[PDB]
Every structure is written in structure tokens, then in C-alpha cells.
């Protein structure tokens, strides 16, 4: 036997080098999103007066009077002279347009990519997205109309804005299918990876709400939960309350992330999006055992797996006593004919924690996924005290992440994501560890490591800081400053000076600082003194 | 101080291939390339020049206010002041008044018209000089008057 | 000359004449007619 | 309504029973920008009846029509507005 010559065969190989996001209740960059589920943050909030009144909840118009929203401020804010936006321009831009600009810059920030590197290079640009409260907002009176509405709010923006601001020439669309628009893009950018369209694909979805027209709409037909917290696979399962937000992920040939060395999440084995259609149905907000089954069965047979070597699955499991029992008996179909009680397998939902996102939840569910894949660990489910009685559990060997819990330390994992929109369409793809092993990472890691006493590194480094306004990187200098206590454990000083020299890009506002180490950092601060 | 100056004035620094950071040997392992890529992702991004951009027209806040409880309703600015109402008597807020039943109908209440006056003149001493129902004004049920 | 309840409608009712009590007030005028009468009203003048 | 109405025309000029073709993966991809239905629904946000969004949302300008013709393919919708539908038609290429 020989273990050499093992390839990528299948283009279904595609990681994950980065993401960025603004998820309710704070969650801004993968570590403190992290720390924050393994926490059982609660993102539900109480929908303020800037969105609708509260008489609307009172009077029962809308059912509940929570959501899982950003501050409303986070709307607002943004910073249009960094990209090219006139300010007069600025209001007439939609919010989720906003979020996805700023969410995008974070996210190539985080994938250790200068922009400056990617402009006028084909990379697709796939989102998501089903309203336009914000241009529902403005159609308020039809005598003002200004003409720099639609340009400002369009579909086609959501998409064509990121790519106009950022050279990417793949092909740009933006997806509807509500519940599951945004996993939908990650499938089609798998599609336009696979097939040598482009070398580089950005898939993300957004979901604003500033209009209570579409919240009551579905309140009335009772989709929305009552008493106003989401609660997955539970008896109190009443319906699953709306929230807000958005973000990306960057996805790159696998063969390719590795060979520039980039940090990879996650790798994607594939899978596939179908509808219910008529299968086993009887009308269109229906949810089909059979359809979910063979979408499970078919994305299983792609990614050429066993249903045995599944460790996880992200349950669409939304709050409904109607659709969570079926769909959680459509799994159990596949998998407990092949797991056994003592080592089940393991269900869960982001939508517990920061609520239902209404057309971002595929997005929601692939950084939950790959913040777990990246972690060796399962997050915590909350709002779970009683199963819901329709669930059968130890008849299916099927059971639910309560507490934190580590992977074997020697085992593949792989996880699967399901999310299925309401009108019928169900997406799932098959995630996995990025198969570089780590076991034995420990000598090459440890290369760098207990090499720091050396007189060579006693040298003292040209740290770079750039920015694009004066205020920019001043504020980015105060908050490496006050964590002084955090960074000198956590991270070797050299670390740093790589990441502050190679990770940034080069901004105008240009600053250069002179250190050793952290306190020789705080010490040389500044060498403003007379000069 | 000079390559921080040259930086500074618009001369881009390779400062990577400068201090030798990158590979610029033959021998650099996986994690030469990448413990930094993993060990600095806690770093703050890039902190924004954030400025708050947004309009409604004041017509949304109009409708955004959604029903009343009350039975004055809400304001319809436009000319001598008109206040503007609709009723389902289903609801929760008027719940009360299906205990109003008349020959069969439930029947709006003639001191709902009093508590109307009451409201719009809020807080001050008031004096009804006259006041005449005419016509009487009958609630359904589901259909908003 | 009698006593008025007092409660408030709903939940969200927080002011402190009610339209109820209000029309509840006129029962005590009413009770002081007799025999089999259909009674509407009609007007009402000068009230402080 | 139109899409219904000219998608059961196309399969009688395609000289193809639909019965035929129920309960078999046919994806159907869409292109749609505008809204306007919708947007005259929503003049008014004191009647808004439940039945408003789940005949008027993205989503079903291509779901409809695949739960009203068993097609268990892949079902989006596009936006790009001016070359939306040939996107879509590039979107069947890719899918078949």
C-alpha cells in the first residue's frame, strides 16, 4: 500500500479562507462570535421605536414584539468616502449594500489578502437577498421620488456594487429563494469554482428589516413564534421570530489555498439544492420529508461519503412544532439505521442562538459550521429544556448539543448544513476538517516557537500602520494599544510584525513605529519628540 | 527613521523581503508560513471613519406608528388638526367595546366620542358647549371601519 | 346617586377616564325611567 | 400568473405531455427584478392580509411553478436587472 498521490480529484473540493459578518447581538470577527456562542449568547432583542411602533405588537398586528437585530446605528453607519461613495450618494444606498461593503473589506482583512492584490482578477461575487425594506421605505410618496433611488437599491446592486468596488469580474448575480437564498449562493459558488470559471468565489447573503409590512404578513399566517423567543426542538416550539443582518465568505480552489498557505476553515465536499415541489406535499408552505431525504441522500452520494462518518449536521430547525419534527425525521431516515446511542448523531441551530435570520441563515449556518470545524469543538444550543414529544430520540439514536463538546482528537469530521426556504426549495452541503493533518503539526509549528531568545530577535522591527483617514488609524493605534495585556500572551511580538507587515495593505495615511517587543512597543509608542 | 520617513512621504516598502521576514532562505516549514496566519486573526480590523447616512421620508414615521389603542387614533398632519382612526373591534385594544350590543349590533359607544374630545384637548379644563349624535355608527367583526 | 366601578378596558389603557366609565356614568340617569322604552341619545349640552 | 400561463403554452409547443414530466429533476431558473404588485399591495399598511407575500415573494416566481409541475430541480430566481434572464439561461447551462 501506498498513501502518496492523493488529489483533489473531485473540483467539490473548495475551502473557506475567511468570513466577516454583523450577526445580532455583537458578533463582528470569528473570535468574538466564537466566544460568544460557547457562551449561549441570546441575540433576541426588543425591536426599538426606530423600526415600528410598538402598537403594532400590542394589538397582535405583528405576534411578537422581538427580533434578533443589529443596533440601529450599525444600519446607519459607514464611511462612503473610502469607497468612492459621495456622500450625496450615501443616503440613497441601501443598509444591507452598507453591510456588505464593510462586512467584505473585514472579511478580505481577515483572510490575510491585501484587496490591492485581487483587483481585476475574475473572482465571482454570489448573494443573497429577498426584500428592500430600505426601498419600500423611501416609496413612501410618489411625488419626490429623487433619481438616485433605484441605483441606490436595486438587486442588481447587492452584487455589482461589491464588484465595482473591488474588480472582481466573475459573474455577478444575487439570489431570491428566501429561507435559503444565501446557502443557495454557496452552491452556485461551488458551481462557478468547479468549473474553471473563475479561480476565486465571495458568497455571502444580507437581510434588512425597516418595514413592519412583511413582518405582519407573516405573523398573520402564524409563522412567527408568539411569545417571542425561538426555541428549537422544543414543546414550546411556537414559531421563529425574524432578525437582521448579513455577511461573506471567501472561497478559493483548495489546491490553491494551500499552496499560498492561507488559514483554511473548512473544505467543502459539495452537495446540492432541490424543491419540494409536489413530492409528498399538499401546498407550497409545506416542508416535504421526502424532498429534504433526497436532498440529503444526493448531496450524501456527491460528496462520495458514508452517512456513518457524519459527526454534525446544522438542523434548519426553526421553532415550528410543524416542520422541526419533519424534517428531523427526514435525517433520522438517513442516519439512525447508522449511529448508535452512545455516540449519536449531533443536531443544532445558529437560529437559537441569534434567532432565524430570515434570508442570511444559510451564511449564518456556514460560519457557525466553519468557526466549529476550525475549533474542534461544538458549540452549545440554547432555549433546550424539554424535547419536543413529536421528536422520537433514542428511536432514532439522535441527540442535541447541550454543552460545549471537543471532537476525538482521531477522527475526520464532517458536518453537513441544512436550511430549507419556505417555499419549498431545501440547499444542503456537505462540510468538512481541511484533510492537512494537525497531529502531527506540532514539529513544524514548534519551528518558530522556543526561537524567540536569540540576539536576532532582540531586533528591533519597522511595524508599518496604515489607513485611509487620519482618524482611522488613530483609532486603530488606540485599540492595539489598550490591549496590552491580552496580546503579550497570546502572540509572539514576531508574529505581529509579520502580520502587521504582510496582511495589511497600503493605505495613505502611512505610519511607522519602531519596537522589540510589547513593552518596546508601548515605550516607542510615538517618536514625535522634536521630530 | 529614514525608511519610516520614505514609507511615510509615498515610497512603498517591501518591509516584508526587507527585515528578511517572508522566506528569503531555501528552509521555511508550513507553520513559517502560516503560525502568524492563525495566531493574529484576535487582531481589531480596520476601524471605520464611521459617519451616519439615512433618509425617511417623514410619511414613513407617519405609517410606521401603526393602529391606536386609544379611540382618537393617530394624526394625519394636513390643515385644521384631523384625527384619524381605524377599528377592529376583534382586537385586544377595543376588545371591550363587543359589550356593547344593541338590537343585535354592537354599536359604537356615544362617550367614545367624549373620551375623543377629551383627548385632543389633553390636560386642560374643558367645557362642551353642545354635542349631538346624528347618526349611529355600527362595528363588524374583521372589517376595519 | 351611585358608585362607578373602576378598571381599566385593557392592558394598554393607562388614561384615567375610560370611554366605558364615561358611558357607564349615564345608567344611574337612565335607571330613573320606567316601562318598556327604546332609548337613544340624542344630544347633551354644557358639560365642564 | 404569466409565467403558469406560458410555461404550460411552452410544453404544448415543445410536443411534450406534462404529465410525463412530474416527479423528475427539471431545474427552473427565473429572472425577476421588479416588485410592482407587491408595491401596490403595500400602499397601505393598516389592511395588509397574510395571503399578500406568498403570492408575491422572490422566491415563488420559480417555486410556483416547480410545486405546480413536480420539477425537483434546482429552483432560484435571478435579479441582474437588464440581463437577468440570460443569466438565467447560462444558469440552465450550468445546470444541465
Given at each position: ?282 401546498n407550497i408552505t409545506q416542508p416535504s420529508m421526502k424532498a429534504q431525504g433526497e436532498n440529503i441522500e444526493i448531496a450524501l452520494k456527491k460528496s462520495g461519503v458514508n452517512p ?193 507587515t504582510i496582511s495589511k495593505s497600503n493605505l495613505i495615511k502611512r505610519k511607522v513605529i519602531t519596537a522589540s517587543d510589547w513593552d518596546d512597543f508601548l515605550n516607542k509608542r ?6 | ?145 | ?48
Amino acid at each position: 500500500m501506498t498513501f502518496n498521490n492523493i488529489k483533489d480529484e473531485n473540483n467539490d473540493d473548495i475551502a473557506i479562507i475567511g468570513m466577516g459578518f454583523r450577526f445580532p447581538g455583537g458578533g463582528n470577527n470569528p473570535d468574538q462570535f466564537w466566544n460568544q456562542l460557547s457562551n449561549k449568547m441570546d441575540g433576541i432583542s426588543k425591536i426599538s421605536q426606530e423600526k415600528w411602533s410598538r402598537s403594532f405588537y400590542e394589538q397582535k398586528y405583528i405576534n411578537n414584539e422581538y427580533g434578533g437585530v443589529l443596533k440601529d446605528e450599525e444600519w446607519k453607519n459607514f464611511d462612503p468616502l473610502f469607497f468612492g461613495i459621495s456622500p450625496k450618494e450615501a443616503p440613497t444606498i441601501d443598509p444591507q449594500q452598507r453591510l456588505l461593503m464593510t462586512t467584505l473589506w473585514e472579511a478580505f482583512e481577515d483572510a490575510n489578502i491585501k484587496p490591492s492584490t485581487l483587483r481585476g482578477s475574475d473572482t465571482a461575487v454570489f448573494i443573497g437577498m429577498m426584500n428592500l425594506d430600505y426601498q419600500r421605505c423611501q416609496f413612501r410618496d410618489i411625488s419626490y421620488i429623487n433619481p438616485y433611488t433605484v441605483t441606490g437599491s436595486a438587486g442588481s446592486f447587492v452584487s455589482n456594487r461589491l464588484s465595482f468596488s473591488f474588480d472582481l469580474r466573475g459573474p455577478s448575480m444575487t439570489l431570491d429563494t428566501a429561507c435559503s437564498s444565501s446557502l443557495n449562493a454557496v452552491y452556485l459558488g461551488c458551481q462557478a469554482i468547479a468549473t474553471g470559471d473563475s479561480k476565486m468565489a465571495i458568497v455571502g447573503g444580507v437581510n434588512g428589516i425597516f418595514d413592519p409590512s412583511i413582518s405582519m404578513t407573516f405573523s398573520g399566517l402564524n409563522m412567527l413564534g408568539h411569545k417571542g423567543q425561538c426555541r428549537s426542538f422544543d414543546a414550546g416550539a411556537d414559531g421563529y421570530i425574524r432578525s437582521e443582518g448579513g455577511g461573506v465568505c471567501i472561497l478559493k480552489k483548495y489546491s490553491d489555498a494551500i499552496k499560498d498557505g492561507d488559514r483554511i476553515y473548512c473544505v467543502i465536499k459539495g452537495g446540492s439544492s432541490n424543491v419540494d415541489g409536489y413530492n409528498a406535499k399538499t401546498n407550497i408552505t409545506q416542508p416535504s420529508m421526502k424532498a429534504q431525504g433526497e436532498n440529503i441522500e444526493i448531496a450524501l452520494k456527491k460528496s462520495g461519503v458514508n452517512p456513518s462518518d457524519i459527526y454534525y449536521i446544522e438542523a434548519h430547525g426553526t421553532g415550528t412544532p410543524v416542520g422541526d419534527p419533519i424534517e428531523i425525521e427526514a435525517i433520522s431516515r438517513i442516519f439512525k439505521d447508522n449511529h448508535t446511542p452512545d455516540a449519536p448523531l449531533y443536531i443544532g441551530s445558529v437560529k437559537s442562538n441569534i434567532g432565524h435570520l430570515e434570508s442570511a441563515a444559510g451564511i449564518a449556518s456556514l460560519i457557525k459550521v466553519a468557526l466549529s470545524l476550525k475549533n474542534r469543538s461544538l458549540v452549545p444550543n440554547i432555549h433546550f429544556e424539554k424535547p419536543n414529544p413529536l421528536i422520537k430520540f433514542e428511536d432514532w439514536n439522535i441527540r442535541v448539543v447541550t454543552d460545549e463538546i471537543q471532537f476525538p482528537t482521531n477522527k475526520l469530521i464532517n458536518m453537513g448544513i441544512n436550511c430549507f426556504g419556505l417555499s419549498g426549495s431545501n440547499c444542503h452541503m456537505i462540510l468538512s476538517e481541511a484533510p492537512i493533518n494537525y497531529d502531527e503539526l506540532l514539529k513544524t509549528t514548534n519551528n518558530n516557537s522556543t526561537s524567540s531568545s536569540s540576539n536576532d530577535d532582540k531586533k528591533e522591527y519597522l511595524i508599518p500602520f496604515s489607513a485611509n483617514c487620519n482618524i482611522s488609524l488613530d483609532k486603530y493605534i488606540e485599540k492595539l494599544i489598550s490591549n496590552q495585556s491580552i496580546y503579550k500572551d497570546t502572540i509572539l511580538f514576531k508574529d505581529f510584525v509579520k502580520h502587521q507587515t504582510i496582511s495589511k495593505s497600503n493605505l495613505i495615511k502611512r505610519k511607522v513605529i519602531t519596537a522589540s517587543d510589547w513593552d518596546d512597543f508601548l515605550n516607542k509608542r510615538n517618536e514625535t519628540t522634536s521630530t | 527613521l529614514a525608511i519610516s520617513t520614505l514609507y511615510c512621504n509615498g515610497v512603498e516598502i517591501d518591509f516584508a523581503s526587507g527585515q528578511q521576514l517572508l522566506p528569503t532562505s531555501s528552509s521555511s516549514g508550513g507553520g513559517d508560513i502560516s503560525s502568524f496566519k492563525e495566531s493574529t486573526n484576535k487582531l481589531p480590523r480596520y476601524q471605520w471613519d464611521f459617519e451616519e447616512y439615512w433618509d425617511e421620508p417623514n410619511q414613513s414615521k407617519m405609517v410606521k406608528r401603526g393602529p391606536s389603542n386609544n379611540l382618537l387614533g393617530h394624526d394625519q398632519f394636513a390643515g385644521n388638526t384631523l384625527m384619524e382612526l381605524f377599528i377592529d373591534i376583534n382586537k385586544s385594544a377595543h376588545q371591550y367595546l363587543k359589550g356593547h350590543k344593541i338590537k343585535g349590533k354592537y354599536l359604537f359607544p356615544g362617550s367614545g366620542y367624549i373620551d375623543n374630545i377629551l383627548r385632543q384637548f389633553n390636560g386642560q379644563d374643558i367645557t362642551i358647549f353642545n354635542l349631538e349624535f346624528s347618526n349611529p355608527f355600527f362595528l363588524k367583526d374583521g372589517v376595519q371601519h | 346617586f351611585f358608585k362607578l366601578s373602576m378598571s381599566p378596558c385593557s392592558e394598554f389603557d393607562k388614561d384615567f377616564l375610560n370611554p366605558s366609565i364615561i358611558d357607564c356614568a349615564f345608567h344611574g340617569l337612565l335607571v330613573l325611567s320606567e316601562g318598556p322604552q327604546e332609548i337613544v341619545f340624542d344630544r347633551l349640552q354644557d358639560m365642564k
